Design a protein around this ligand. Structure first.
Ligand SMILES: [Ca+2]
Lengths: 123, 68, 155
């Protein structure tokens, strides 16, 4: 089912040209014991329709009741604990009732790190 | 889904680039939430909602006052 | 009239105290004339608020997103609030980014038990445990709760 991924999506801006996508598939973190995830490499040119169809139909995620996208900074260090409570006892606790997609940085930066741990705790 | 899917943006804080992000997310209509008391672009946008150059310098000491 | 107008040009430095309290008005007047935001100019006001138990003044004026606080600013105020039994300031200072894991050390933990009243029961228990200098709190816990339920303090 993932075979046509290099054909629908492209990797790498007038100095560059598009090429078939190479990095894709499922993703397992070594020794984390977490559920098997999914990942994809794609260019910024990609229109959202193909990616949304991929997520909803190939990866099998159901349509979300609501979507909240969290944007912020502070980079490395974790936020002050009242922001932590706003994330956990606020946004994530509310999203637990309706079911939702929470979109943010997928990195170990502070905001994404605390979003992930709050989602895991309520999971 | 045939129910519409609401989308919301939450702004904890930000640098000068988060102002551009908010402007782009506002021109293409998307509701935004600003966290009060967290400083940065969130507080800068919150305090004007509810000395303007002084405020902009207060939350962006190095910012370009006219462009901001 | 000219003098009064010259004075009233700068109302930020004037406050009215009415008999209908003193500490709140002092805090308001001190905050009103600060201006800067480097978090070094507000330490004095924070110490005064801790000493006078002005929770709302601190939470409203001193801890705003403009002022960029961090741990080393608030450690001394946290210790002051711990020693002098100010629960609201203990809650407020921790919620604003004071890393408790790094803050707590055996030295300060022993210093906290030094704040017990001289005639209190815990003081007598600590003295008896020491007569049987670390705080020796674990010995007191063993004497009180027994081996079955006593925590092996420190945890
Ligand atoms: Ca001062």
């Amino acid at each position: 089912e993932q075979s046509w991924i290099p054909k629908i999506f492209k990797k790498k801006d007038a100095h560059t040209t598009e090429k078939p996508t190479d990095a894709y598939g499922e993703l397992d973190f070594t020794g984390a014991g977490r559920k098997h995830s999914n990942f994809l490499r794609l260019s910024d040119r990609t229109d959202p329709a193909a990616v949304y169809s991929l997520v909803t139909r190939t990866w099998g995620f159901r349509a979300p009741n609501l979507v909240v996208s969290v944007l912020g900074g502070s980079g490395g260090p974790v936020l002050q604990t009242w922001l932590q409570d706003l994330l956990r006892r606020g946004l994530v606790r509310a999203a637990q009732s309706t079911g939702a997609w929470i979109v943010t940085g997928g990195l170990h930066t502070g905001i994404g790190r605390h979003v992930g741990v709050a989602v895991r705790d309520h999971q | 889904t045939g129910i519409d899917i609401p989308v919301l943006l939450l702004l904890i804080d930000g640098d000068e680039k988060m102002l551009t992000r908010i402007e782009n997310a506002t021109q293409a209509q998307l509701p935004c939430l600003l966290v009060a008391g967290s400083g940065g672009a969130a507080d800068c946008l919150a305090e004007t909602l509810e000395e303007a150059r002084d405020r902009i310098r207060r939350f962006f000491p190095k910012g370009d006052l006219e462009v901001l | 009239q000219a003098q009064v107008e010259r004075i009233m040009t700068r109302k930020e430095l004037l406050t009215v105290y009415s008999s209908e309290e003193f500490e709140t008005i002092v805090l308001k007047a001190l905050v009103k004339a600060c201006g800067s935001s480097e978090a070094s100019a507000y330490l004095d006001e924070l110490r005064l608020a801790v000493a006078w138990n002005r929770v709302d003044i601190a939470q409203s004026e001193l801890f705003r997103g403009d002022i960029q606080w961090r741990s080393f600013h608030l450690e001394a105020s946290l210790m002051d609030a711990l020693l002098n039994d100010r629960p609201e300031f203990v809650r407020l200072l921790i919620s604003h980014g004071l890393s408790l894991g790094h803050f707590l050390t055996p030295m300060r933990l022993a210093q906290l038990y030094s704040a017990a009243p001289s005639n209190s029961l815990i003081r007598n228990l600590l003295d008896q445990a020491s007569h049987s200098r670390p705080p020796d709190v674990g010995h007191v816990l063993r004497m009180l709760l027994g081996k079955m339920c006593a925590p092996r303090y420190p945890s």
